[PDB]
Design a protein around this nucleic acid. Structure first.
Lengths: 73, 248, 18, 120
RNA sequence: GCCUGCGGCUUAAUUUGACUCAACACGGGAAACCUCACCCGGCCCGGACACGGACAGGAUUGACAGAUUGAUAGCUCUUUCU
């Protein structure tokens, strides 16, 4: 659909009670805009030296760290 | 025959890290001559784990008065040695104090009330024993009996903290312990002693939990005390909790 | 085989080239 | 098989005192020192596990920590797991190892098979 | 050639600070136990309060033997006695 166009959104409360939630206008329509889903993996630094630290509770194997090695913290 | 064996079990229990004990150990609640057994075993040379498992057998088997006199003659002096030495407690002895709370009656009559009867009833000893008391569950009637006996004493630094944690047991009281408490609070009425922060917290806990058993003359005695013995912070909270009460 | 893979460019949508 | 001019039936029928000239320097040394109660109990578990097996069958493997055990020839024919820190390695005690220790049969680390230097 | 440090490679772990003087046989550190500080397996328990169930018709500790995981782990299951 070619812009401009209004963007209403409503949700079934119960038995056809369409309740309005969202409202806006139509941006560029194309599949090229790819969405990136993020995941934060947590940890705890239980040994602390000068600029070097041992952290647990982020993985549980050993070679998991060999799998997620180049990814920066 | 006896002295050889119990000198042997002394030299075993002098470094007790682990290991299953012989049958010479586990019949001391059946040994009548256990006091003459007990000095050859040389009580201060023991590992605290030997203390732990000794209190384990002695709470799993004994009477009340033998448990009390073992708490008094053996346990309490080494407890004060380790607290005055370490200023902390060994975990074997800490769990051994839970093992000594495997009997509440000999605990109150032998350790706590004799600790405040000892006259040197300090602060860190009080915090340790009261935290362990807070951990365990004790009977209701003996809780009121212990509060009855603790209110009978002087005021050291260790009356209020045990009084506050026994209020943190949170049961419901008879009339006698309440009259004795409010009468002791009327004994602190015009005394110019700067009574600690933890005493104000103790009175605060008392009006928080026991707001349901206040008479009129008792409430006026409480207002007399709050009128004469303030603090810049907790006297208004005790005032507010006395302004939010329901009588008996 | 650790933090990389193939994932080549294959099969797209109908692009209406202006 | 023969060891030092003595055969397997000859060894297994030989007394514990006469073994103590047929061994190495360390082994006669330790048998002079006399075995410990832990190793006595381990040999007792080996006796129980080698006896109760079916006669076609090899005995049930007994796992153990004690890497410093002299392989007595009475142990020959059993299967023993030897602990090298992580993993009980299960060795069939053949008669060729009667003058050694268990500890050499569960090789403790993994062999170094090099890579390449990065920033040196 | 051998030996020791640093890096690097390996390993479950092959402990760690300094990084061209003042890094570098320094943390007295020459490692069979101690000197773990590393790894793999086990034991013992990791709270108080408030709600509902088991609870004296036992709640449950200790408790002698025999099977245990790598270990007399009665802290596992028959003895189920207390």
């Amino acid at each position: 659909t070619f812009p401009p166009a209004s963007v209403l959104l409503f949700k079934q409360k119960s038995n056809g009670m369409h309740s309005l939630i969202a409202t806006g206008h139509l941006m560029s329509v194309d599949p090229d805009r790819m969405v990136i889903k993020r995941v934060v993996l947590s940890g705890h630094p239980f040994k602390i030296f000068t600029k070097m630290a041992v952290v647990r509770y982020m993985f549980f194997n050993r070679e998991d760290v060999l799998w997620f090695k180049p990814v920066e913290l | 025959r006896v002295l050889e064996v119990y000198r042997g079990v002394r030299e075993v229990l002098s470094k007790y890290r682990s290991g299953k004990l012989p049958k010479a150990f586990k019949i001391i609640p059946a040994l009548s001559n256990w006091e003459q057994i007990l000095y050859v075993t040389e009580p201060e040379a023991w590992t605290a784990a030997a203390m732990y498992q000794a209190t384990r057998i002695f709470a799993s088997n004994l009477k009340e008065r033998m448990a009390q006199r073992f708490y008094n003659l053996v346990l309490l002096p080494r407890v004060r040695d380790d607290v005055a030495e370490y200023k902390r407690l060994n975990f074997h002895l800490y769990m051994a104090l839970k093992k000594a709370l495997f009997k509440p009656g000999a605990w109150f009559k032998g350790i706590l009330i004799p600790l405040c009867e000892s006259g040197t009833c300090t602060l860190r000893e009080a915090i340790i024993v009261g935290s362990i008391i807070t951990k365990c569950s004790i009977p209701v009637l003996h809780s009121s009996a212990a509060m009855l006996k603790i209110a009978e004493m002087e005021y050291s630094g260790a009356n209020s903290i045990f009084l506050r944690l026994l209020l943190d047991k949170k049961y419901a009281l008879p009339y006698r312990v309440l009259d004795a408490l409010v009468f002791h609070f009327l004994g602190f009425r015009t005394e110019k002693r700067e009574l600690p922060v933890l005493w104000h917290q103790c009175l605060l806990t008392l009006v928080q939990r026991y707001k349901a058993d206040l008479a009129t003359d008792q409430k006026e005695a409480l207002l007399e005390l709050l009128r004469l013995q303030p603090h810049p912070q907790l006297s208004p909270e005790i005032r507010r909790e006395l302004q939010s009460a329901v009588p008996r | 085989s650790i933090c990389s893979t193939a994932s080549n460019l294959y099969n797209h949508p109908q692009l209406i080239k202006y | 098989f023969t060891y030092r001019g003595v055969d397997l039936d000859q060894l297994l029928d030989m007394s514990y005192e006469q073994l103590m000239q047929l061994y190495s320097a360390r082994q006669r040394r330790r048998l002079n020192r006399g075995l410990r109660r832990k190793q006595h109990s381990l040999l007792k578990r080996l006796r129980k596990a080698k006896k109760e097996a079916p006669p076609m069958e090899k005995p049930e493997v007994v796992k153990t920590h004690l890497r410093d055990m002299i392989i007595l020839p009475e142990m020959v024919g059993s299967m023993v797991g030897v602990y090298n820190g992580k993993t009980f390695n299960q060795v069939e005690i053949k008669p060729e190892m009667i003058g050694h220790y268990l500890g050499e049969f569960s090789i403790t680390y993994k062999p170094v098979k090099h890579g390449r230097p990065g920033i040196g």
